Amino acid sequence: AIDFLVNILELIKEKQCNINLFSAISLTSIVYNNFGEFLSNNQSYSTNNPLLKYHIIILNDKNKTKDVEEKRNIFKREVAELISRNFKLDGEKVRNYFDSLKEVLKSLKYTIVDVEITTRTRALIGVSTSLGKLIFGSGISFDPYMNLPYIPASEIKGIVRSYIEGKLGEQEAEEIFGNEEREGNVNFTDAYPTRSKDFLFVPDVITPHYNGKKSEADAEPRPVIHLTIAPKVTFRFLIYYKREDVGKPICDSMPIILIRGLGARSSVGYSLFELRKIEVIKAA
Amino acid sequence: EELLMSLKLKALYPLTGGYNRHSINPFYEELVRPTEIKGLWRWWNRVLFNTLAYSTKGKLYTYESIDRLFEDVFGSENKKSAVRLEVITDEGNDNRFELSYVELDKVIDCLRNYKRKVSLDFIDNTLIAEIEGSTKIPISFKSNLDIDKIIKDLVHNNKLLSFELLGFKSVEIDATKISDKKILKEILRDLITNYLEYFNIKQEVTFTLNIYLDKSREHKQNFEDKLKFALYSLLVFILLGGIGRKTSRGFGSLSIIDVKCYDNSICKKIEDLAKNFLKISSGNELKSKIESILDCIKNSCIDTLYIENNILSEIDPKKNVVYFINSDLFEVKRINDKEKVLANIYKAVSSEGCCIKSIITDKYVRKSFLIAFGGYRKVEFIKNYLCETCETVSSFNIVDFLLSEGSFMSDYILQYEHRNSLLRFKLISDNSNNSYLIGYILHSSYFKKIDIKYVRCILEKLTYCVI
Amino acid sequence: STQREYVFIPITNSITIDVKITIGGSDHITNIDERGIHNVLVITGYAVDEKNGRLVPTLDPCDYVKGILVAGTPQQAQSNDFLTLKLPANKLYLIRKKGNISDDLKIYIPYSSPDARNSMKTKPVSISDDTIVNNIIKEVFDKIYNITQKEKVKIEKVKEDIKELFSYYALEQ
Amino acid sequence: STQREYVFIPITNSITIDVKITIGGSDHITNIDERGIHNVLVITGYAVDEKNGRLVPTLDPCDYVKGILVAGTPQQAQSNDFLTLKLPANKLYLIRKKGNISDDLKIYIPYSSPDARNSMKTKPVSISDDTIVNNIIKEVFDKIYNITQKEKVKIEKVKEDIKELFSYYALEQ
Amino acid sequence: STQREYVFIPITNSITIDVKITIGGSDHITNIDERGIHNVLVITGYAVDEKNGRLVPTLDPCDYVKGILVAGTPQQAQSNDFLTLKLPANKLYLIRKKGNISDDLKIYIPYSSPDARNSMKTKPVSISDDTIVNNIIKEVFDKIYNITQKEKVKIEKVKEDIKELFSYYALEQ
Amino acid sequence: STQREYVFIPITNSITIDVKITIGGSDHITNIDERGIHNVLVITGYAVDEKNGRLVPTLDPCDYVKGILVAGTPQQAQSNDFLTLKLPANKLYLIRKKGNISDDLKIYIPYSSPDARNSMKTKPVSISDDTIVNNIIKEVFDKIYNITQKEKVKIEKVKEDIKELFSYYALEQ
């Protein structure tokens, strides 16, 4: 129903962190992409939907079209700010999830390594994944059932393996992470945020001027509002394995590989992390 | 991967910005953006490479070709960059902008059923919500943003800062149909925040820019001399440009403080040319060092070892504009105090600027000089001074201009809003409480051919008058 | 040392005989320059005591009135009931400033005391009733402005934009 | 009706006794709830002297003053010189609105003559110099809130508030 | 220059007589600055003791010790059997990096005998037992930092975050 | 031609007398009309020898002095210490140009000789301490342009822009 739509920003700001952020942003994108139509006397006539504020303000009169376009740019920035301030992190469900998962693994006689890492710079994990993609163009790796951003276990394993084969050759890697003829000896869970300082998401911009341009005569900034993971957000994941060998290469690999990137745009210092804590539970 | 170098730098009155053109926002504070450093590094690398390729071969290559060439250090869609930038700073902790309260219940009542503008203004450390419909109200508020009077009058006296403030200070509001109060509170608090954050203008911003090198991209064919040229262009950038906005007017200017390096076999001469700037005696010595480093690329025992590759492409001077250094238009002057310098640079680039009505002293001629150099002007004759083939009194002849007939260069010079200023200005210092304005003019690839030292006379008259 | 004089501009019919400065000394701060009307003064916080048109001091920062500024003291037999004051001549909250200031002037205000008789209810009543826009040609500028009707053909603008230019708050007692 | 008189708060400390009425009832519009003040009134268009300053008026909506309006009539040896009207009390520029005024009161404010032979050039001062702030409350706060030093036995919370939201423009003459 | 004292954080009473100049200068590296602890140094390949408790070299990269980084000397009775060393101030693994360290450093970590008699059977142990936390709190952060119980009241957050931030691998042999 | 000569404007106590003919008629090039000094004739490649007040020729375009134009004669007992030259009317170097000039120049500048024994050093000297600039108006800006205060009210713009625009270097001997 359209009434679910024209009242979805109110929902984001009142149900904060208890709403399904994936579906919320997905439905918000319909308003965002039909802005000119949702403003033509279809604000639901409420008083706490941000949508009639764009009827008080006047940005242009010589063009209704330009009016709508500038209002829509403002509205994109405001959606970014809404998500970032309202959708905070409550990481109690994740702490319970990981404690129970670790108990399960202790039953299955694995040796668990529970690693806690902290974001140091606005991170970008899953920048091509769909979340805010239909508004911002970028995205975040978002688990719509934990209702959180997460770091895929495949990504962490790929980075750890890239490093281990960097400094131990392309054969001890396959001895640890297997190949097309052996299964790996090391398992990785996804990483979920367990505790932030203030925010979980954060608006940001990127404004290419010259990327893919010939000269100065075709240069033009195109600014790309998007969402990133705030600093000081702490993720945790598990690492479990049955042989005692692979404990050695992963331990020392953990502190090293994190200070260099763990997501996107590491080259310009974005997804820089910080080993907060590591801990090894041996089974037998 | 290991550290390549690390440059303790310093920015002077930088005007950064993210997603809201201010350097501070409700969530974090960002004075130096590593993305901007990377982008400006690449832009200066293209400018420097065209400078070299036009000195040694009189040819100019498109930007796409140049960064396709430098892909192995700067990266592209096909290869990840080999240089990983960093930016570390003091107070890199939680430093957002919080607006604790703002008392505006009254201006709301002043905005009932009225289609009226609401302009803001700081008036003697008190901000006024001057309603254009003949009303003024001394709004009160509290914020962790401690704006000092120095910043307020720096923005008030600088007629360019006060110009880019026309878009952070004014909202037209239509309450004639009807308006709740809780909605005008939101609108006006948005206005207040967009105004307040504009005054987060710091100074003495000091940051350690690290460079990490991808070892796996070791010398394939020309990785080493490419990377060395790249570090040389990083030096050129740190010395002639700045971070943030309005760097073509002195703001955001950079200054070397210490450059510790960690691999001499790549960085020896770079660190040397860097440390040469840790203390500068006087004006012309700095000028000599600028020239020494500008021509160490062109005529020293090593200039280039890779231009002999045919990945590049020549510009189509009817299509393309490219910038490059002239290495002779680099007047320098000492300033003794930096704020008034920035306040006066407006006099040096304004059509009716009293520091230009003294140097050219003519209508339709100042206009031409400022449409050719000095970035995109808003033009309302003059093109007679901008022809390609017509009377050359003052040589401002654009490559492909023709009378009463538009061509690509014609529209580009008259109507193209994003066009940098060839006439640029730099403020440097060397940790010894002395500072030298650096004025210069990049050479564009749309100038047919200019009379160099005539424009150099103009430039030195500027740099002597603009103080 | 030097003085000025604020002339009301309400819609009332009380402009011709309240003053004796028909010429000023030799000038007019408020002047029309064929672009429109320029450099008129706004006095906020003071509502209009309509009868004997003068401003009553209110505390409301939102009560404003509009008028012109000239030089003089009214009627040659007055200034027993006014508010005269000297100022840096920049605290003027002028609008449409197309002139200049002598950097220093003194101003007499046509002032009516509060007279606390009841609760007050000011009312925004923009100027209208084009019979008033014509008698503020007749009584006001055909006399104050010996330049009116004799120099410009552009009286139509200086009679049509008046709707926008001026307004006031009537308390309506 | 209940009568409210407005007293200002400069750095100067001389206005101790002209508010002669303690309360006269059970109400003080200003509230002190271990936070600072509440329901503070600001008057724009009025400069101030430092002669136990009255609220001399100006024509500048930036010339503002901030004080506190209390219950009672000031000793009836003043307000004969002062400006005294009434109005529906929603026209009060009441900042930090906490309560809900009955929407009508009488206002008396220390008000001077415009000082016709002087230029009312102003410059604004804010309440600081804690050597003065220590007894600025003794100037105007001890004679109003007896519970001072008994409930608010903490000093900084209640002293770093009028520093925040109390200032004025001053003639400095 | 600025010679540093890495005082790791064990759970036994080995932090009593170990230093001569515990004063250093105007800058430490490990901080407590209204956010928690900063710039904590993490070392690997080393496991503390608790009877004459210092670091013994071992080559299990899963062993690791964390501690503080303050400017000092090793009591001038040691550094004959300690680890003095000079690092270029970027090869130090600082958890919770706040700013930048000063381009070179001189570190004195306590480097006991390799213990060639016994065999290394390192055992992980963290910091708990809130009194064992509080006593070394009084012993280290109160002494080295003029901050605690002079600049901070909220160091209970420090109490609850040291019990998890700091840990090590030890032997108990 | 219209014979003239040059005078400097330092903070120095050496500006007593350097001219016989001050008017030479009714024309100067550094005219004044409510915008401060116009056509400030700037020279570069020189400094001032303010004690023994004279312009000493150094050879660095970083050094400069900015004075004004006086249409007359410096005691006519000169060329032992001065420099004379006629110009094609734009080999000059102005500040806030007014217009085109009379095709002819003759300017005498107070010059000094090297006395090269000491390693002389140039230093920037800015017009500051507007008390000495009040004296400057009293000594070098009353009699040269006495038309001020007789045609120009703006005797404040002059001191402001002398504070701002007139700066020079010295020798520090």
PDB file of N, CA and C in Angstrom, chain A residues 198-252:
ATOM      1  N   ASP A 198      29.203   6.001  18.816  1.00  0.00           N
ATOM      2  CA  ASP A 198      27.963   6.743  18.653  1.00  0.00           C
ATOM      3  C   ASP A 198      27.152   6.288  17.455  1.00  0.00           C
ATOM      4  N   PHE A 199      27.770   6.169  16.291  1.00  0.00           N
ATOM      5  CA  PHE A 199      27.043   5.873  15.072  1.00  0.00           C
ATOM      6  C   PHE A 199      27.457   4.519  14.526  1.00  0.00           C
ATOM      7  N   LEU A 200      26.593   3.968  13.687  1.00  0.00           N
ATOM      8  CA  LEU A 200      26.903   2.776  12.920  1.00  0.00           C
ATOM      9  C   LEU A 200      27.149   3.083  11.459  1.00  0.00           C
ATOM     10  N   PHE A 201      26.322   3.925  10.869  1.00  0.00           N
ATOM     11  CA  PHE A 201      26.531   4.425   9.528  1.00  0.00           C
ATOM     12  C   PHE A 201      26.864   5.899   9.595  1.00  0.00           C
ATOM     13  N   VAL A 202      27.344   6.409   8.475  1.00  0.00           N
ATOM     14  CA  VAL A 202      27.875   7.760   8.387  1.00  0.00           C
ATOM     15  C   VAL A 202      27.794   8.194   6.934  1.00  0.00           C
ATOM     16  N   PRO A 203      27.280   9.378   6.640  1.00  0.00           N
ATOM     17  CA  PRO A 203      27.250   9.832   5.255  1.00  0.00           C
ATOM     18  C   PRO A 203      28.646  10.194   4.791  1.00  0.00           C
ATOM     19  N   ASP A 204      28.839  10.117   3.486  1.00  0.00           N
ATOM     20  CA  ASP A 204      30.113  10.499   2.906  1.00  0.00           C
ATOM     21  C   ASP A 204      29.873  10.843   1.455  1.00  0.00           C
ATOM     22  N   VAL A 205      30.908  11.368   0.818  1.00  0.00           N
ATOM     23  CA  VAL A 205      30.818  11.778  -0.571  1.00  0.00           C
ATOM     24  C   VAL A 205      32.079  11.322  -1.283  1.00  0.00           C
ATOM     25  N   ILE A 206      31.969  11.222  -2.594  1.00  0.00           N
ATOM     26  CA  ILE A 206      33.113  11.048  -3.468  1.00  0.00           C
ATOM     27  C   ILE A 206      32.771  11.802  -4.740  1.00  0.00           C
ATOM     28  N   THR A 207      33.696  12.620  -5.212  1.00  0.00           N
ATOM     29  CA  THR A 207      33.415  13.558  -6.293  1.00  0.00           C
ATOM     30  C   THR A 207      34.506  13.462  -7.343  1.00  0.00           C
ATOM     31  N   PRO A 208      34.430  12.471  -8.226  1.00  0.00           N
ATOM     32  CA  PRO A 208      35.363  12.425  -9.352  1.00  0.00           C
ATOM     33  C   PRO A 208      35.194  13.635 -10.255  1.00  0.00           C
ATOM     34  N   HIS A 209      36.314  14.275 -10.577  1.00  0.00           N
ATOM     35  CA  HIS A 209      36.358  15.353 -11.556  1.00  0.00           C
ATOM     36  C   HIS A 209      36.907  14.878 -12.889  1.00  0.00           C
ATOM     37  N   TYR A 210      38.014  14.146 -12.853  1.00  0.00           N
ATOM     38  CA  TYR A 210      38.787  13.844 -14.038  1.00  0.00           C
ATOM     39  C   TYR A 210      38.819  12.373 -14.397  1.00  0.00           C
ATOM     40  N   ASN A 211      38.341  11.491 -13.527  1.00  0.00           N
ATOM     41  CA  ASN A 211      38.367  10.064 -13.811  1.00  0.00           C
ATOM     42  C   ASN A 211      37.654   9.768 -15.119  1.00  0.00           C
ATOM     43  N   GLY A 212      38.401   9.243 -16.085  1.00  0.00           N
ATOM     44  CA  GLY A 212      37.835   8.915 -17.375  1.00  0.00           C
ATOM     45  C   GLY A 212      37.593  10.099 -18.275  1.00  0.00           C
ATOM     46  N   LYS A 213      38.368  11.163 -18.123  1.00  0.00           N
ATOM     47  CA  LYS A 213      38.195  12.371 -18.908  1.00  0.00           C
ATOM     48  C   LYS A 213      39.408  12.579 -19.801  1.00  0.00           C
ATOM     49  N   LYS A 214      39.194  13.294 -20.899  1.00  0.00           N
ATOM     50  CA  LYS A 214      40.281  13.549 -21.830  1.00  0.00           C
ATOM     51  C   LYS A 214      41.091  14.772 -21.427  1.00  0.00           C
ATOM     52  N   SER A 215      40.417  15.884 -21.170  1.00  0.00           N
ATOM     53  CA  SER A 215      41.087  17.155 -20.980  1.00  0.00           C
ATOM     54  C   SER A 215      40.363  17.924 -19.884  1.00  0.00           C
ATOM     55  N   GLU A 216      40.672  19.212 -19.772  1.00  0.00           N
ATOM     56  CA  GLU A 216      39.936  20.084 -18.875  1.00  0.00           C
ATOM     57  C   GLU A 216      38.607  20.524 -19.463  1.00  0.00           C
ATOM     58  N   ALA A 217      38.433  20.396 -20.774  1.00  0.00           N
ATOM     59  CA  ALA A 217      37.231  20.885 -21.428  1.00  0.00           C
ATOM     60  C   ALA A 217      36.041  19.968 -21.238  1.00  0.00           C
ATOM     61  N   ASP A 218      36.246  18.790 -20.659  1.00  0.00           N
ATOM     62  CA  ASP A 218      35.150  17.901 -20.315  1.00  0.00           C
ATOM     63  C   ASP A 218      35.175  17.525 -18.842  1.00  0.00           C
ATOM     64  N   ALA A 219      35.975  18.210 -18.032  1.00  0.00           N
ATOM     65  CA  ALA A 219      36.011  17.937 -16.608  1.00  0.00           C
ATOM     66  C   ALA A 219      34.785  18.523 -15.932  1.00  0.00           C
ATOM     67  N   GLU A 220      34.269  17.795 -14.960  1.00  0.00           N
ATOM     68  CA  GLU A 220      33.081  18.184 -14.223  1.00  0.00           C
ATOM     69  C   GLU A 220      32.999  17.335 -12.967  1.00  0.00           C
ATOM     70  N   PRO A 221      32.778  17.932 -11.805  1.00  0.00           N
ATOM     71  CA  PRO A 221      32.565  17.120 -10.608  1.00  0.00           C
ATOM     72  C   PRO A 221      31.186  16.480 -10.628  1.00  0.00           C
ATOM     73  N   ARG A 222      31.139  15.211 -10.234  1.00  0.00           N
ATOM     74  CA  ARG A 222      29.885  14.493 -10.030  1.00  0.00           C
ATOM     75  C   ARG A 222      29.931  13.917  -8.625  1.00  0.00           C
ATOM     76  N   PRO A 223      29.207  14.507  -7.680  1.00  0.00           N
ATOM     77  CA  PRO A 223      29.346  14.121  -6.278  1.00  0.00           C
ATOM     78  C   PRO A 223      28.410  12.984  -5.913  1.00  0.00           C
ATOM     79  N   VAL A 224      28.953  12.022  -5.188  1.00  0.00           N
ATOM     80  CA  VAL A 224      28.280  10.757  -4.938  1.00  0.00           C
ATOM     81  C   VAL A 224      28.116  10.629  -3.432  1.00  0.00           C
ATOM     82  N   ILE A 225      26.960  11.053  -2.922  1.00  0.00           N
ATOM     83  CA  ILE A 225      26.643  10.795  -1.529  1.00  0.00           C
ATOM     84  C   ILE A 225      26.510   9.293  -1.355  1.00  0.00           C
ATOM     85  N   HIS A 226      26.968   8.790  -0.221  1.00  0.00           N
ATOM     86  CA  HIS A 226      26.801   7.380   0.077  1.00  0.00           C
ATOM     87  C   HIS A 226      26.963   7.189   1.574  1.00  0.00           C
ATOM     88  N   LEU A 227      26.808   5.952   2.017  1.00  0.00           N
ATOM     89  CA  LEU A 227      26.920   5.609   3.421  1.00  0.00           C
ATOM     90  C   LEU A 227      28.156   4.761   3.642  1.00  0.00           C
ATOM     91  N   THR A 228      28.843   5.011   4.740  1.00  0.00           N
ATOM     92  CA  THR A 228      29.987   4.218   5.130  1.00  0.00           C
ATOM     93  C   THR A 228      29.776   3.786   6.568  1.00  0.00           C
ATOM     94  N   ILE A 229      30.615   2.890   7.033  1.00  0.00           N
ATOM     95  CA  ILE A 229      30.547   2.429   8.406  1.00  0.00           C
ATOM     96  C   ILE A 229      31.363   3.377   9.266  1.00  0.00           C
ATOM     97  N   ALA A 230      30.734   3.920  10.304  1.00  0.00           N
ATOM     98  CA  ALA A 230      31.365   4.910  11.151  1.00  0.00           C
ATOM     99  C   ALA A 230      32.672   4.384  11.734  1.00  0.00           C
ATOM    100  N   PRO A 231      33.550   5.277  12.174  1.00  0.00           N
ATOM    101  CA  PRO A 231      34.718   4.840  12.935  1.00  0.00           C
ATOM    102  C   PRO A 231      34.317   4.313  14.300  1.00  0.00           C
ATOM    103  N   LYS A 232      35.252   3.607  14.923  1.00  0.00           N
ATOM    104  CA  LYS A 232      35.120   3.063  16.268  1.00  0.00           C
ATOM    105  C   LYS A 232      34.054   1.983  16.383  1.00  0.00           C
ATOM    106  N   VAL A 233      33.549   1.466  15.269  1.00  0.00           N
ATOM    107  CA  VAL A 233      32.627   0.339  15.303  1.00  0.00           C
ATOM    108  C   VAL A 233      33.433  -0.943  15.423  1.00  0.00           C
ATOM    109  N   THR A 234      33.056  -1.797  16.365  1.00  0.00           N
ATOM    110  CA  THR A 234      33.790  -3.022  16.655  1.00  0.00           C
ATOM    111  C   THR A 234      33.056  -4.217  16.060  1.00  0.00           C
ATOM    112  N   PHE A 235      33.712  -4.917  15.147  1.00  0.00           N
ATOM    113  CA  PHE A 235      33.209  -6.166  14.603  1.00  0.00           C
ATOM    114  C   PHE A 235      33.857  -7.328  15.330  1.00  0.00           C
ATOM    115  N   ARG A 236      33.190  -8.468  15.297  1.00  0.00           N
ATOM    116  CA  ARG A 236      33.820  -9.691  15.751  1.00  0.00           C
ATOM    117  C   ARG A 236      33.383 -10.837  14.860  1.00  0.00           C
ATOM    118  N   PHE A 237      34.264 -11.819  14.734  1.00  0.00           N
ATOM    119  CA  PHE A 237      33.979 -13.030  13.989  1.00  0.00           C
ATOM    120  C   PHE A 237      34.723 -14.159  14.672  1.00  0.00           C
ATOM    121  N   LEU A 238      34.423 -15.380  14.262  1.00  0.00           N
ATOM    122  CA  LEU A 238      35.111 -16.536  14.800  1.00  0.00           C
ATOM    123  C   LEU A 238      35.968 -17.182  13.728  1.00  0.00           C
ATOM    124  N   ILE A 239      36.961 -17.933  14.186  1.00  0.00           N
ATOM    125  CA  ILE A 239      37.798 -18.752  13.326  1.00  0.00           C
ATOM    126  C   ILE A 239      37.965 -20.088  14.022  1.00  0.00           C
ATOM    127  N   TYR A 240      37.538 -21.160  13.376  1.00  0.00           N
ATOM    128  CA  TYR A 240      37.569 -22.462  14.012  1.00  0.00           C
ATOM    129  C   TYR A 240      38.188 -23.486  13.079  1.00  0.00           C
ATOM    130  N   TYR A 241      38.832 -24.476  13.684  1.00  0.00           N
ATOM    131  CA  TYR A 241      39.600 -25.476  12.967  1.00  0.00           C
ATOM    132  C   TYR A 241      39.853 -26.634  13.910  1.00  0.00           C
ATOM    133  N   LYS A 242      40.130 -27.798  13.331  1.00  0.00           N
ATOM    134  CA  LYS A 242      40.299 -29.011  14.116  1.00  0.00           C
ATOM    135  C   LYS A 242      41.749 -29.422  14.300  1.00  0.00           C
ATOM    136  N   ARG A 243      42.606 -29.180  13.316  1.00  0.00           N
ATOM    137  CA  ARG A 243      44.025 -29.448  13.477  1.00  0.00           C
ATOM    138  C   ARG A 243      44.678 -28.308  14.242  1.00  0.00           C
ATOM    139  N   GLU A 244      45.715 -28.636  15.007  1.00  0.00           N
ATOM    140  CA  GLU A 244      46.368 -27.605  15.800  1.00  0.00           C
ATOM    141  C   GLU A 244      47.392 -26.812  15.001  1.00  0.00           C
ATOM    142  N   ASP A 245      47.880 -27.363  13.891  1.00  0.00           N
ATOM    143  CA  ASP A 245      48.826 -26.691  13.009  1.00  0.00           C
ATOM    144  C   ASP A 245      48.384 -25.273  12.671  1.00  0.00           C
ATOM    145  N   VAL A 246      47.247 -25.150  11.985  1.00  0.00           N
ATOM    146  CA  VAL A 246      46.842 -23.889  11.383  1.00  0.00           C
ATOM    147  C   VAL A 246      46.630 -22.784  12.399  1.00  0.00           C
ATOM    148  N   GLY A 247      46.673 -23.100  13.692  1.00  0.00           N
ATOM    149  CA  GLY A 247      46.623 -22.050  14.690  1.00  0.00           C
ATOM    150  C   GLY A 247      47.764 -21.064  14.551  1.00  0.00           C
ATOM    151  N   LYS A 248      48.950 -21.557  14.191  1.00  0.00           N
ATOM    152  CA  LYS A 248      50.116 -20.678  14.113  1.00  0.00           C
ATOM    153  C   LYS A 248      49.994 -19.627  13.018  1.00  0.00           C
ATOM    154  N   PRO A 249      49.782 -19.979  11.748  1.00  0.00           N
ATOM    155  CA  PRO A 249      49.792 -18.941  10.709  1.00  0.00           C
ATOM    156  C   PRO A 249      48.687 -17.920  10.857  1.00  0.00           C
ATOM    157  N   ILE A 250      47.529 -18.306  11.387  1.00  0.00           N
ATOM    158  CA  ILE A 250      46.433 -17.352  11.486  1.00  0.00           C
ATOM    159  C   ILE A 250      46.689 -16.353  12.602  1.00  0.00           C
ATOM    160  N   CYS A 251      47.140 -16.823  13.772  1.00  0.00           N
ATOM    161  CA  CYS A 251      47.431 -15.924  14.884  1.00  0.00           C
ATOM    162  C   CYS A 251      48.216 -14.709  14.422  1.00  0.00           C
ATOM    163  N   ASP A 252      49.453 -14.935  13.976  1.00  0.00           N
ATOM    164  CA  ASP A 252      50.304 -13.821  13.597  1.00  0.00           C
ATOM    165  C   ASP A 252      49.784 -13.098  12.372  1.00  0.00           C
TER     166      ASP A 252
END
